[model samples]
Target: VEFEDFCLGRDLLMGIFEKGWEKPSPIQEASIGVALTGQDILARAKNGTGKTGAYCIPVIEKIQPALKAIQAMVIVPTRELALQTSQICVELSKHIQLKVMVTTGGTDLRDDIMRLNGTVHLVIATPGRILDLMEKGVAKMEHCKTLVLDEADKLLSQDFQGILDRLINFLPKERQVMLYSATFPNTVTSFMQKHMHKPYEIN
Candidate 1:
């Protein structure tokens, strides 16, 4: 179906059309509606199937642009993914004056801290560096309303599980959570069970 069927704001719909997006992909079709309702979602879809838009669209729609603090957070497995996801969010929010920040390892910590001093609407980060920033009081999650795990399976894997666990402690309990992955292992399932609250599942 067309994105207009979702009844998003005029500016948001304009941004979607400007990106040359006409119809929603299957994943977007199934997940966007649920996400916009502030429901937690556990989604399994193949890569390049517009799963990113499924979460990003709702996030950009729900954000209060005037609020200074971070309103949404997207956690990815690697720096490249974080940058890519942040770019998508930036593009989607072009019509709106929303500040989207991307923080990963190998970047200047001081620069990130400086950026945080200003109004930030969304943060796209890797688990390790974001956790570090949270510990240092650079990245704040107090006002954050939504959290997305882009590659949920990878983030819940052995290498990232420890840091991810610690990061969860920093997020507010009363918030929306969305987990999107191409595949879900038992560990990922268990992680969702412990963290997500009555999440809608879409495959």
Candidate 2:
């Protein structure tokens, strides 16, 4: 799609322009539309292929920044990915009054708990730490409308499968679920089938 035809709202477009993005990357071009329409999109793209923006734009567009609780939750495989994704989410929603939080293992649990006392609009977290917070009732995904599993092939590994399953069960069934990764093997397919509904698969 042409930039003008695919252009987002002025506010969001301004932010994109400010970030020096003249046009959408292949991944964004292929997958963003379906995602923006509230579909469960499973995208397979490499790391530097603008997958961050692919997920961010649609998420920020759908989220109500004025609302208190977390409207979007992104599950990453590692703390590094969580931090990076959190930064991207913050930048993408900077024009709005959205709150972004990153939860990982190395961070002080008490500190995260304290932060949770207030309202958070978006959370980018690793499975273990996020599950810990979920168990403590410090955070809830019942209100999470958009859930993205970045690097699903890795996040769904044996080490994380059990915790991820429990966490998935906690989320609202009617919510949108997206899985973005560089590769999607049979394992990823199985996970998607068991956890996701009629999803829009894109590359």
Candidate 3:
């Protein structure tokens, strides 16, 4: 489906079109409308599929440029994913001017802390660094509206569940969650059922 018919504004739709996209990917075409309508979605697609933008576009739409704190957060399993996701957020949000910050374990925490003082609209992070920042009072999720767990299976496989479980306490209960995964196990489903509210599964 075209983004124009999905309530996407002209500018955002133009950006999508400029990226050589004549139509949304199968995943995006199927799920972006659901997400745009404010449904929590668990979308399972193959690796290298356009699942990132499927979720990212909706998250970007949800972001309010007038607000300062991080409005959307993406949690990924690795630093590479965090960085890559942040870049994608930047590209997708170019017209909207959303600031994307990525926090991972390897970087200097102080530097990240310094960056946090400025306004950041979206954050793509690894579990460990985010929790550490939360503990240090350098990062806050009180104002966050959207939460995403990309590569959910990978995070679980790497034993990051404990960190994620702890991280949940920091997020507000009333928020939208979009999880994209290459594979789904019973454990992952259970986690989603436990955490999400009336989530729509689009596999």
Candidate 4:
């Protein structure tokens, strides 16, 4: 129905209206509620289908600004997508006290490390770079509670192969995962079997 029905934070509500979102898209309608409840999710929607807001809305809502640790990590398949996702997160988080760090290869790792040393509430990154940070102990995942994989098909493909498996150990054992993509590889079934906790599915 309407965005107001969600009873989102005043800051987020302002950001949504400022984005000229006159109405919530179908994907947002379906995913936002479940996401707010802290559940694993498997969402299938075509690109530019407004799925970004589906998770972004709830992710921004769930983060605790005073906690002072990364609460959410969004993994995309490309540097461009990581920046784009980070941009949207930052935009939506404008009125809220949320800090988002978008890191990828080619950028100065030193700057990233310095930023990581600060109060970061969310991270948007590609697989390898984020994994590298994880292994180096610079970007700790102990406080990370929500992991979002954008372009789930691409991340699960051969290019990223076993990255998520390794990333699992870095994150809290009890965490929420949301996979969003236009399509998913059958291979992702293995991840669901091993890590998911009765994820909510939306097609």
Q: What is residue 66's positional error in candidate 4, in angstroms?
A: 0.8
Ranking of models by TM-score: 1, 4, 3, 2
lDDT of 4 by residue, 1-203 (tens): 88888959989999888888878999999999899998999888877728888888999999999999999999888898888888888888889989999878779989999999999999998888998898999998888999998887777787545887787668898999998878766757777778889999999
Model 1: ten consecutive residues of lowest lDDT = 157-166
Off by over 4 Å in 4: none
Q: On a 0 to 100 scale, what is the lDDT of residue 67 in model 4?
A: 92
lDDT of candidate 2? Answer: 0.82
**Higher-TM-score candidate among 2 and 4?**
4
What does the lDDT read for residue 5 in candidate 1? 81
Cα lDDT tens digits for candidate 3, 1-203: 56777778666776676766687788988888889777788888776538888888888887888898988789988898777778777766668867889999878988999999999889889988898998898887888878888888887666645777778678888888888888989767877878888889887
**Model 2 TM-score?**
0.93
Judged by whole-model lDDT over C-alpha atoms, candidate 3 comes out at 0.82
C-alpha lDDT score of every prediction, in listed order: 0.87, 0.82, 0.82, 0.87
TM-score of 1: 0.96
